[PDB]
């Protein structure tokens, strides 16, 4: 049981933050699925890990 803290960075620069809980694997997986959900409107994305992997930045290209 961990908590992955995510920065959802959109094309316009605005930022939303989220947290996913569970095993490091599932919580990370949830973050990626959430990104795909948001991609349908925010565009393609890239993700980068930090904080020993606990922190994550997801940047959407927009369009």
């Amino acid at each position: 049981e961990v908590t992955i803290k995510v920065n959802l960075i959109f094309a316009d620069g605005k930022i939303q933050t989220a947290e996913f809980k569970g095993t490091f694997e599932e919580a990370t997986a949830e973050a990626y699925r959430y990104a795909a959900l948001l991609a349908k409107v925010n565009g393609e994305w890239t993700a980068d890990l930090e904080d020993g992997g606990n922190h994550m930045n997801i940047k959407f290209a927009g369009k």
């Binding site: 605005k14 930022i15 939303q16 933050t17 989220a18 996913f20 699925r33």
Partner: protein
């Protein structure tokens, strides 16, 4: 038993922005017969009972703001708030009623992001009524600040004090979306009187230097 998985666990968003919450069921919730997905969304604010927003996966209850929209079918569902407001600060739960037992998701906590705000700090010496009882409680309020992260530090005659301190934090204010905190330093009437300077220092990102509030017993 149908397991309901909600994500994210919590979301922080600025006013007026779009919010998306997801809920997934371990198995289809679509009632092939009535052709309706038995999935509902409930909103619960601090201290209150839950309140339905959406049912049949996408039907909004009368009176619920049209900024709330439910979508999905089968095992994947989403609840969307088109332009979030302070009154949307709460925990959201999806619930399936396709096959007993009815089961809820763990919920998604929704919080607002706003402009930083320094805390308003007020210190209060023990009340004569309490001292007349043999106890001394020094209270300090750090009100309406943002972000929620803040640290408090007491000092009796210029020296840090840590034992006898109780802190409490409120949920995000439903009006200005700020946070508040209370810190009580309890000492014996004897301890209290053997000292004169009492200080409450608040450290918040809004200032490089802590906001200090104090009083002198001799005054």
């Amino acid at each position: 038993d149908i397991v309901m998985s909600q994500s994210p666990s919590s979301l922080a968003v600025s006013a007026g922005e779009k919010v998306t919450m997801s809920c997934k069921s371990s198995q289809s919730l679509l009632n092939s017969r009535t052709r309706k997905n038995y999935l509902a969304w409930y909103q619960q604010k601090p201290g209150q009972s839950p309140k339905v927003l959406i049912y049949w996966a996408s039907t909004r209850e009368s009176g619920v703001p049209d900024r709330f929209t439910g979508r999905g079918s089968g095992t994947d569902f989403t609840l969307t708030i088109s332009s979030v407001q302070a009154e949307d600060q709460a925990v959201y739960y999806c619930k399936q009623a396709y096959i007993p037992p009815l089961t809820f998701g763990a919920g998604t906590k929704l919080e607002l992001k706003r402009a930083d705000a320094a805390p308003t700090v007020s210190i209060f010496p023990p009340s004569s009524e309490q001292l007349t009882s043999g106890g001394a409680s020094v209270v300090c309020f750090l009100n309406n600040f943002y972000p929620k992260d803040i640290n408090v530090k007491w000092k009796i005659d210029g020296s840090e004090r840590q034992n006898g301190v109780l802190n409490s934090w409120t949920d995000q204010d439903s009006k200005d979306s700020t946070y508040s905190m209370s810190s009580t330093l309890t000492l014996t009437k004897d301890e209290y009187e053997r000292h004169n300077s009492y200080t409450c220092e608040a450290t918040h990102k809004t200032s490089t230097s802590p906001i200090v509030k104090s009083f002198n017993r001799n005054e």
